[PDB]
Amino acid sequence: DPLLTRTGGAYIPPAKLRMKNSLAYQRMSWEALKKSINGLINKVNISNISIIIQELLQENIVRGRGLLSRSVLQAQSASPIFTHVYAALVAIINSKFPQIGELILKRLILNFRKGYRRNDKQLCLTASKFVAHLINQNVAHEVLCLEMLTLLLERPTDDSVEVAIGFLKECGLKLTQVSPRGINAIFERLRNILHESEIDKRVQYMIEVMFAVRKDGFKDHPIILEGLDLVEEDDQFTHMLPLEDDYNPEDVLNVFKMDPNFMENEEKYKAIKKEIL
Amino acid sequence: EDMTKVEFETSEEVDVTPTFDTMGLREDLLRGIYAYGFEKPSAIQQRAIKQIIKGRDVIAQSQSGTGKTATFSISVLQCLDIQVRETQALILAPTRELAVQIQKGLLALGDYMNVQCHACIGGTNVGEDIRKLDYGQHVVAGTPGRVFDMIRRRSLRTRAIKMLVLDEADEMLNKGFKEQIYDVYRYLPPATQVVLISATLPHEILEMTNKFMTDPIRILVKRDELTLEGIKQFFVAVEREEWKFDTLCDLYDTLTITQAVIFCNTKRKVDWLTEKMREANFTVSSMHGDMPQKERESIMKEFRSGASRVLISTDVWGLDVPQVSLIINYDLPNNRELYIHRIGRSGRYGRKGVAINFVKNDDIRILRDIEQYYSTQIDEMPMNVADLI
Numbered sequence A: 001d002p003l004l005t006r007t008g009g010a011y012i013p014p015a016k017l018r019m020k021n022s023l024a025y026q027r028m029s030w031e032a033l034k035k036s037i038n039g040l041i042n043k044v045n046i047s048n049i050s051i052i053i054q055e056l057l058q059e060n061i062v063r064g065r066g067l068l069s070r071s072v073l074q075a076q077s078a079s080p081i082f083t084h085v086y087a088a089l090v091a092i093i094n095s096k097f098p099q100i101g102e103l104i105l106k107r108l109i110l111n112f113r114k115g116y117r118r119n120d121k122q123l124c125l126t127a128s129k130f131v132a133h134l135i136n137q138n139v140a141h142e143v144l145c146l147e148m149l150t151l152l153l154e155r156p157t158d159d160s161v162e163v164a165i166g167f168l169k170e171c172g173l174k175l176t177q178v179s180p181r182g183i184n185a186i187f188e189r190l191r192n193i194l195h196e197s198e199i200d201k202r203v204q205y206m207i208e209v210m211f212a213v214r215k216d217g218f219k220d221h222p223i224i225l226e227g228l229d230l231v232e233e234d235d236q237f238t239h240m241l242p243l244e245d246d247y248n249p250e251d252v253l254n255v256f257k258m259d260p261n262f263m264e265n266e267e268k269y270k271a272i273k274k275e276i277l
Numbered sequence B: 001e002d003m004t005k006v007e008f009e010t011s012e013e014v015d016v017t018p019t020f021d022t023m024g025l026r027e028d029l030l031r032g033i034y035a036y037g038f039e040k041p042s043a044i045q046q047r048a049i050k051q052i053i054k055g056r057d058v059i060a061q062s063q064s065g066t067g068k069t070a071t072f073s074i075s076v077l078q079c080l081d082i083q084v085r086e087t088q089a090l091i092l093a094p095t096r097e098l099a100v101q102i103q104k105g106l107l108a109l110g111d112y113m114n115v116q117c118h119a120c121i122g123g124t125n126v127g128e129d130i131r132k133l134d135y136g137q138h139v140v141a142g143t144p145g146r147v148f149d150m151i152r153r154r155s156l157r158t159r160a161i162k163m164l165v166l167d168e169a170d171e172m173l174n175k176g177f178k179e180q181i182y183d184v185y186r187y188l189p190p191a192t193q194v195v196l197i198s199a200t201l202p203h204e205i206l207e208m209t210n211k212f213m214t215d216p217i218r219i220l221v222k223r224d225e226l227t228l229e230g231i232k233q234f235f236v237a238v239e240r241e242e243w244k245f246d247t248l249c250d251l252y253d254t255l256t257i258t259q260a261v262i263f264c265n266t267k268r269k270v271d272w273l274t275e276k277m278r279e280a281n282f283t284v285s286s287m288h289g290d291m292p293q294k295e296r297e298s299i300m301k302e303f304r305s306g307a308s309r310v311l312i313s314t315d316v317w318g319l320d321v322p323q324v325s326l327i328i329n330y331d332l333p334n335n336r337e338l339y340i341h342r343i344g345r346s347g348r349y350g351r352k353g354v355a356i357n358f359v360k361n362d363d364i365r366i367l368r369d370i371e372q373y374y375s376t377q378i379d380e381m382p383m384n385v386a387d388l389i
Helices: A014-018 A021-043 A049-057 A065-078 A080-096 A098-118 A121-136 A143-154 A158-178 A180-195 A201-215 A262-276 B027-036 B045-053 B068-078 B096-109 B123-135 B144-153 B169-174 B178-186 B203-212 B241-254 B267-279 B293-305 B338-343 B361-374 B383-388
Strands: B008-010 B058-061 B089-092 B117-119 B139-142 B163-166 B193-198 B217-221 B231-239 B259-263 B284-287 B310-313 B324-329 B353-360
Touching: A014 B231, A014 B241, A021 A049, A021 A065, A021 B241, A049 A080, A065 A080, A065 A098, A065 A121, A080 A098, A080 A121, A098 A121, A098 A143, A121 A143, A121 A158, A143 A158, A143 A180, A158 A180, A158 A201, A180 A201, B027 B068, B027 B096, B045 B058, B045 B068, B045 B217, B058 B068, B068 B089, B068 B096, B068 B163, B068 B193, B089 B144, B089 B178, B096 B117, B096 B139, B117 B123, B123 B144, B139 B144, B144 B178, B163 B178, B169 B178, B169 B193, B169 B203, B178 B203, B193 B203, B231 B241, B231 B361, B241 B353, B267 B284, B267 B310, B284 B293, B324 B338, B338 B353, B338 B361, B353 B361
Parallel strands: B058 B193, B058 B217, B089 B139, B089 B163, B117 B139, B163 B193, B231 B353, B259 B310, B259 B324, B284 B310, B324 B353
Antiparallel strands: B008 B217
16 A cells, blocks of 8 residues: 555546557557456356356466456455355366466465464455355365364454354355365364353354354355356366465466567467367 | 334444344244244344344444344343353343333243243342342343342342343433442443443433443434535546446456446436446346336345346435445436435445546536535546555
């Protein structure tokens, strides 16, 4: 905020604005790509995800993999109400470009850790919610959920328990299926907190809620909503990314830079596009 | 009067729980709730119950019959550990008769919970009050004076108290019970949650909440007021009608938007813009005057649920859409009074917002008219608007 440089002036409508070359063209194409992605990410919802994917795939999302990752991550952070939809979108892209799903996951994990470190509850709540749904979508391995829950529950605070319980609600049904002993360990831990600890009303209530959810079999928290399970089981690529690893977010990929092999790299992508359509 | 029509607002954003089954209530309580005859929770209930049971200090205010008694009765029961045979909640009321009425209510709702509740009678029954308190009652109710006597006598142990409810607090103050109420609160454990229920908000009540509460949630009857204060208003000089859609599209390529509401002046424009955005792969709900109020409300439900991320409307409603990031006046209203009704903040706690006005040269004067009329300011939209949300 006080660090980032300040660029003022009036917004100018595109219709109004329109009323060497290699660099100029790469920059222009870069700017159009960023805008196109931004629009698609704003548009995506359950009823239109397939068309959004098709329109997204027309763009060079390899060259713009950082741009796409950033747009999806910013969108989910501002609009966690659509987390399930962003997860499904990521799941489809990852099935075709696993390296892009991996880049999103790496940054999301780092985002969660930043939030935890800074005691930024909201960011912990939204980043964890995203993790849960990427797990639901088999984009990320459940070891990440288990490790985050253990971290949150080690020195339980009102905020740390809140994050953990909201998180377990979202990925719990999936957890139960792929790692019943793991989720059992989490519940035992919650049980020890509920009795073998000196807790306040807020913590006690959130835990009783979590046990209540498990008893009804997560009836209000299905793994994937009808309309979003769009990747065939065997076509998905499940990344095994632990919580603690020293991931490189590669945010430098978000910044425009002249590409000497721009020609080759461009023709390379269209060869990919024609493949998966 | 139909007290179901009474509207409330909250001092911070809260989860609005539409049903008793979405509140996170223990099952044996829910059994008692439905068995009593409850079906749908009232507006105050859909807001206050969740906040009390999650542990927040709460001030709840409205005239009689909006569901305030059920609100604290249910919340008190939810927080009981039946296995602990010690008083865990205290309910102060302006009369003994109301205390008894409260007790009976608690017993009914808590019938599947094995709850123990006692209303302190006094009179020739003080000995009997003492007996019961010594035995151990999960909930005790009565006047501040009577409750304070039992505490002072040591008949009412306070060590397990987690909750204090002040029922009809303004009336207790009117009866002269202020001292007794402060006296009771002074003898309770440090972390005690406090819930205050009152039809009115005089100074003594607000000072009382300041002294008894920590970061309280205020749930009050909504103020019938609108203002442009707190709304960031911008205009974009689009110059020509034919340039509006391209500009809207560019905003969506540059801004971060959760949901947005788009106003137009005419059903015709709404139908047109809906077709255009849908063809552009937006998810859109559209609303206009040709449809009955029931349809409009249903469509608003669909939009609020997130089924669509764009709501396009004529002037048919202020709005309550917590997930709405931005309001766009695709058309500037010909009438100046409709402007605030589109983008205004309602209530003392109305959400801050952002409005973006598309202005043709044709509308240069109507824009200026609006600015003058509300005595407000509407800046030219800056390129870094995305940073200001």
